Amino acid sequence: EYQNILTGVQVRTAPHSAPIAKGIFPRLGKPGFSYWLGKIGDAQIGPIYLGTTGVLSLVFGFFAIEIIGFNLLASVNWSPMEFGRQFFWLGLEPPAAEYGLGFAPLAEGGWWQIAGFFLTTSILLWWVRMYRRARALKMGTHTAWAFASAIFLFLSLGFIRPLLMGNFSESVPFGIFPHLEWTNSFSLNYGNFFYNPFHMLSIAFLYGSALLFAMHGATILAVSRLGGDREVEQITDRGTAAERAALFWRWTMGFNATMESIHRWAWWFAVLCTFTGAIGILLTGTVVDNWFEWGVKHGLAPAP
Amino acid sequence: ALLSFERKYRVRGGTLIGGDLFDFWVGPFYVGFFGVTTLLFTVLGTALIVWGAALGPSWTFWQISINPPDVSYGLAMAPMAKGGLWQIITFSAIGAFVSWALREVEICRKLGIGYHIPFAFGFAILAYVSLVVIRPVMMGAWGYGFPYGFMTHLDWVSNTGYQYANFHYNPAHMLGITLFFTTCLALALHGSLILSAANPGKGEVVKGPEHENTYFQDTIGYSVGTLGIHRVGLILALSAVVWSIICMILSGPIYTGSWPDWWLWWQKLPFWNHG
Amino acid sequence: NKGDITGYMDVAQVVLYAFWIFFAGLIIYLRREDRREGYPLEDAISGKINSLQGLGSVFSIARPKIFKLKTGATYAAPNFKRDAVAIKATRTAPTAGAPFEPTGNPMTDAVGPAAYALRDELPDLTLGGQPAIVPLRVAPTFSVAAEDTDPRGLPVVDRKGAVAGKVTDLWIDRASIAIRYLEVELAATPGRKVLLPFAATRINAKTKSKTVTVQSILARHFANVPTIAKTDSITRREEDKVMAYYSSGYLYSDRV
Amino acid sequence: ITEGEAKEFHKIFTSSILVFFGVAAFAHLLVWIWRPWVPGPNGYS
Amino acid sequence: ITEGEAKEFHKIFTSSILVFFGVAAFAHLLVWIWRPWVPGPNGYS
Amino acid sequence: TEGEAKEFHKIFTSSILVFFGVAAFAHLLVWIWRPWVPGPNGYS
Amino acid sequence: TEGEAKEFHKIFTSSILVFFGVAAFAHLLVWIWRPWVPGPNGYS
Amino acid sequence: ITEGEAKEFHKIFTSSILVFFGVAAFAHLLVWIWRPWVPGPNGYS
Amino acid sequence: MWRIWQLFDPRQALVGLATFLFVLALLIHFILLSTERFNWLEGASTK
Amino acid sequence: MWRIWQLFDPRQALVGLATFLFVLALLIHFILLSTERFNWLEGASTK
Amino acid sequence: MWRIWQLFDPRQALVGLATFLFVLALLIHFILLSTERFNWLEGASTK
Amino acid sequence: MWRIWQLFDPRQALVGLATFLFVLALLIHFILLSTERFNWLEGASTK
Amino acid sequence: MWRIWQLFDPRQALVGLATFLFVLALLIHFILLSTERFNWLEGASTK
Amino acid sequence: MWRIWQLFDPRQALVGLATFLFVLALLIHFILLSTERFNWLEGASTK
Amino acid sequence: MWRIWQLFDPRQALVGLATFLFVLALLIHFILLSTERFNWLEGASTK
Ligand code: 07D
Ligand SMILES: CCc1c(C)c2cc3nc(cc4[nH]c(c(CCC(=O)OC/C=C(\C)CC/C=C(\C)CC/C=C(\C)CCC=C(C)C)c4C)c4c5nc(cc1[nH]2)C(C)=C5C(=O)[C@@H]4C(=O)OC)C(C)=C3C(C)=O
Ligand SMILES: COC(C)(C)C\C=C/C(C)=C/C=C/C(C)=C/C=C/C(C)=C/C=C\C=C(C)\C=C\C=C(C)\C=C\C=C(C)\C=C\CC(C)(C)OC
Ligand SMILES: CCCCCCCCCCCCO[C@@H]1O[C@H](CO)[C@@H](O[C@H]2O[C@H](CO)[C@@H](O)[C@H](O)[C@H]2O)[C@H](O)[C@H]1O
Ligand SMILES: CCCCCCCCCCCCO[C@@H]1O[C@H](CO)[C@@H](O[C@H]2O[C@H](CO)[C@@H](O)[C@H](O)[C@H]2O)[C@H](O)[C@H]1O
Ligand SMILES: CCCCCCCCCCCCO[C@@H]1O[C@H](CO)[C@@H](O[C@H]2O[C@H](CO)[C@@H](O)[C@H](O)[C@H]2O)[C@H](O)[C@H]1O
Ligand SMILES: CCCCCCCCCCCCO[C@@H]1O[C@H](CO)[C@@H](O[C@H]2O[C@H](CO)[C@@H](O)[C@H](O)[C@H]2O)[C@H](O)[C@H]1O
Ligand SMILES: [Fe+3]
């Protein structure tokens, strides 16, 4: 009874990759092989492409990470021991309300603003990198727009809502426990963030993404004895694996997808999980002061 | 009422129970014995939910709630008016979920495919059972299950989360959140890669597995593979559910205190316990 | 007050209803994409184009999108190329919902779990315009990685333990580096050679000796495995046929 | 599937059922003597 | 497996059953001598 | 794996007895220090 | 192998004996410093 | 893996262990002279 | 009802009835245990 | 009723018999333990 | 009474019985520990 | 007691037995540490 | 007990034994450091 | 005692020994730094 | 004590040694910075 959960016998060949124009930068990384990764998936590692947008994104991101880490280490007076003790509790806090959207003093949130700007720039440059890498390989840019949804949520959390409130004071800090505490206090300040309906939609789409990527993973693993793992080939030439995958769900559920359209569902659930989340974040504080009172007004709560 | 390829696999057999009695289809659905049983449990549970809505004061779909019995009843069966209806709906839901999974098993046997899908659904059934049976039994009362209501089960989630004064600090909860977020990210990447390979633009012949591997080799530095991605995705979702179950068993049955100050153990390891 | 639009209606509710409209449209779009294979629906008995469908039919089926291949080929989705109503089976009851009794040996008649899609007779292509599924003999560069049992020469047995045959060669996918097939020479017929999918094997590297076992079909069933033509490059239809035959074992591996 | 095997197994199944039911009945009698589980009209004295 | 290689397995199994049950009853007897687990009509002392 | 296991069983039982002997000696010492069976009054 | 096992065990027993003797010395020193078995009134 | 280089490795390995343990013991003697790490009955004074 | 077992599998029917009867009896027993009057373990007073 | 096992498979019937008996025994024992009267580990006394 | 062992798997029977009996013993011991009267570690007075 | 090992691999039998003995020894030791009376490290008084 | 070295190669046996021994010793040292009395660094008064 | 070197090649053995000893030295130094008595940098008084 | 380089290739050995030495030096400098006595940047009276 085999399951295609682990690859008992592996194959290793001469590393090769799809052809790209040389460009200013070559492929970098001297590809190698790994055993556990080949047990769970492919064994080859790299090479990683590092173009102009890749260099720009890496430099901006590294600057942001170094600024954040330097501030975290400085907050505990440069003690490696006490840095270890408080690492989770350490955080680069955003500037206070009084400074508006302008530059705060470095100790009072200027470093947070500089780090956030550099991180935003690196994330956007990484988005451009995904777009350009997809276009270079003569492929579509679905990954870029799926990423753009996540960037929308990130910018709504960090920049857009501060713009609307005219204030970075309620932005999320750069810390492990501090950003969870920001989540908790954001929910408390605005009345039981469960009563945010776009939060409910985002949770529905997150649950649906997990559900869908368990359903689809189990379906492809169930038809992997029939060439079902080779999804694009079953999309261009429908084999019996795709037919049985469709008929299983048609018989158990009443309807079914295509090998191509199931990944459209997969794309859209993931994208909507963050799109509705960004909308719900942009709506709180600006339009809806208290989500519990909005729910009471609109029939979500028994009106105490 | 059949797909272009459906009237070729509609053979009999593959049923665990019932023989040829319920081995048939109604419309698109396959029924089997376990389809009959899931109808039995679903109709009864939904009728009981609507009956509890009638006994309730709202009919507002989001304010309809079936509450479990008060904790003063312990693990005892409760009167139907006050607590018992929630218990019967719980048992009916468990029976319907099990019938659903078993019907999926019969469909898998009939189509000659693996039983991965019912096995994966077993984890969702286990999460529900841990929320309404296992955890309330360990805690000693049926009133620790969640109410069957649209917004009231969210009130239960919030109340139980703040019972430990910050439920984020539950480390198993952190790990389950990490797995859920990573599952969503991996699903986005996988659907995006498949769509981009199948729909590459004007001209732009359909790309092969080598192009899909090359994309993530260039962008990330590693590519899992068109078979291994479904593996890692199923494992990601199932592990997220497993660690959520673990974090809810840990809260109440095992740990009955503030999760935030559970982490003081970390603060006081001997190589930085400055005191 | 601050966020309202008209008395009871406010901005958040309006954005919510806008999302609901967008999600209804998105569900329609996704269902249109779903209805790109096996559509339109046929009658369960006669096979005429019929189904209980409403005013959404005009929007149910999408125009055929065109897939371009790196050979000049083209796929149309949906292509309304359907299967024949008359299959090698008979209705248990004439009620349009009843299952089918096979009218022969369903292993070799491609009925039920043995049924295979009627694909095209072309091997999968690599980035270089060559077959992807090839035996290791005609791929000198490819080799089996170490730290794994080499499945060459190991006895091929069923669940009953009878030695069905012996493995001589491995067939692998060039596009994705993994073993696809094991070439098995029959202990009963040296002049016969068969392909057994790698997904249907247990490694069995942890026992008294090393062997390859199959849990689906019995030893005698290896005498009727579908054959292939080129013996060094296999078409999609041939591989789909072989995989369907092997997958049909679990349902009726002991007669019908 | 041998019929004689089933006929032989019937004897051992009957002996097992008799000994198990006897143990259970003795246990229930001991429990009843210790504490009856059928309440009186006034509850439990 | 074998026809007669289970009678000796039955021998060792019944020997193990006696060895386990004897020490189990031995332990139970000491527990009862120490503290009985059946309360009297007015409870425990 | 039919006769060569006789020595394995014999020295297995030898290890059984010696480990149980040291464990019983440990338990005897612990009992002398502090018994683990309460009396009618408990632990006095 | 079989020949290597003789001397391998011959020096394994000596090495474990040396480790156990050092551990016994360490425990005896610690007991001299502070015994870890309390008294009827606890730790004096 | 010829054993001559094994022996040549082992001799200098033993010498290295000896010098490492010697310098470590000298360091421990210096630290003990500085501050002892075994408290007496009354603790640290 | 002469031969109704020429239509229903006796094994499947017997197993289904055993399971149904056990489940129904367990449900009725638990319902009685939920009450104040027929809980023979709590043993409340009729008067 | 010596013809029940003529078609009933013996091994599955006995495995399920033992499992069902054990589960029911656990349930009844725990129910008794939950009672204020038959809990033999505390003995809350009748009168 | 000997054909039972040629009916069942001798290795599976031993493994399952050993683990099941161990789990049962562990549960009984932990229940006794949770009991005020029979906890042999806290040692509260019988009176 | 002569022919047990023909069914169980002695290597894995020893590995599993040693793992079980170590785990159970740790469980008993930590349980005693959690007790007041048998904690030999954070020691308490018998009386 | 010399024959034990045919079941287990000394290669894996010694690395496993060494890592287990070091982990056990380190955990015991942590336990002693943490309790109250055998912590040789804080060195509190015994009485 | 030299026989170690035909199972453990000196490359891996010495790199592992170096990593282990360096980690242990860091551990002991940090543990000392956490104690007041032996923190040679803060230099709290003995009394 | 020169025969080391037959095993350890100078290329990766030097890179690892340099990285380790830099990390150790940085760690010590940070530890010194934290301490109120040896912080040469903030500056504090010894007396
Ligand atoms: C007490 C807390 C309170 C409580 C009531 C509660 C409970 C629950 N909630 Mg919630 N939540 C509360 C508050 C609250 N909640 C959210 C969000 C969500 C979404 C996130 C989706 C996601 O993927 O995020 C995650 C995606 C992001 C943040 C966007 C993409 C991120 C990117 C590209 C970052 C790129 C990073 C690098 C390149 C690395 C280098 C950078 C550095 C080192 C710095 C999701 C659906 C979700 C789930 C649930 C569940 C299941 C529950 C249960 C069971 O109770 N919650 C966010 C949101 O969208 O809200 C509308 C948000 O902002 C916010 C707030 C304030
Ligand atoms: C559908 C909604 C879905 C949700 C649930 C979801 C959530 C979260 N997604 C998260 C993180 C990331 N997401 C990503 C990438 C961006 C990388 C970046 O910005 O680099 C740009 C930054 C930086 C350069 C800064 C640091 C750099 C470091 C640490 C290295 C520093 C050292 C250097 C340079 C020197 C050494 C090395 C040399 C070579 C010299 C990261 C890993 C991406 C995508 N999400 C998508 C979608 C989703 N993301 C899609 C479709 C994606 C992409 O296409 C893209 C990608 O590359 O995916 C592989 C997080 C933390 C999430 C949570 C839960 O909070
Ligand atoms: C490589 O690193 C070595 C040295 C080892 C270590 C270095 C660093 C370390 C250890 C870093 C650790 C970092 C940690 C723990 C980070 C935790 C980060 C988390 C959890 C962040 C989570 C959320 C934060 C978000 C979403 C913040 C978003 C902020 C945004 C988008 C702000 C944008 C602000 C802008 C654009 C400001 C505009 C205003 C002005 C005018 C200033 O712009 C010019
Ligand atoms: C100003 C505030 C801070 C924000 C940062 C602004 C500068 C960084 C973003 C500038 C815009 C980048 O936009 C992008 O630039 C790079 C060159 O840099 C170009 O891309 C170039 O590098 C890519 C890397 O894959 C190569 O294929 C090739 O050398 C060339 O195409 C893209 O054609 C352009 O789309
Ligand atoms: C595979 C095995 C599956 C079964 C495993 C079961 C494990 C746990 C079983 C617990 C059974 C509890 O059973 C139920 O307990 C509650 C506890 O309040 C009892 O409740 C009753 O007694 C308690 C006192 O003990 C009272 O406070 C309560 O008001 C009263 O209703 C019920 O009379 C009993 O029916
Ligand atoms: C495995 C087989 C299991 C078989 C189990 C059989 C259970 C049924 C036993 C029925 C015995 C009835 O016995 C009858 O019950 C009544 C209650 O109505 C009891 O009534 C008597 O005892 C109760 C004790 O609470 C007193 O309060 C009451 O005043 C007194 O009359 C008596 O004991 C007896 O007259
Ligand atoms: C290996 C499996 C172990 C099997 C264990 C079997 C346990 C069975 C033990 C119970 C047997 C009956 O034992 C009987 O119970 C009654 C119940 O009032 C008790 O009756 C006596 O003791 C109680 C309680 O101390 C006192 O109030 C009084 O002295 C007297 O009534 C006695 O203990 C005994 O006469
Ligand atoms: Fe997929």
Side-chain angles (χ1 to χ4, degrees), chain G residues 1-3 5-44:
Chain G
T1 181
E2 182 65 26
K6 299 289 94 176
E7 60 90 20
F8 173 64
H9 199 69
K10 187 269 183 181
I11 62 170
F12 183 96
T13 180
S14 169
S15 179
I16 202 171
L17 188 153
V18 168
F19 171 76
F20 277 42
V22 161
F25 181 76
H27 284 84
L28 188 153
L29 278 191
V30 173
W31 185 271
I32 292 170
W33 172 52
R34 269 166 194 192
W36 52 91
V37 174
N41 295 124
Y43 276 124
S44 58

Side-chain angles (χ1 to χ4, degrees), chain D residues 34, chain E residues 25 28 32 37-41:
Chain D
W34 160 58
Chain E
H28 286 99
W32 192 278
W37 55 80
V38 172

Side-chain angles (χ1 to χ4, degrees), chain B residues 2-24:
Chain B
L2 297 196
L3 294 175
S4 302
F5 43 85
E6 187 154 6
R7 193 185 32 242
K8 182 175 73 175
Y9 310 88
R10 285 204 157 193
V11 287
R12 59 169 283 165
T15 175
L16 300 171
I17 300 178
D20 51 303
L21 187 54
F22 295 161
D23 199 13
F24 64 88

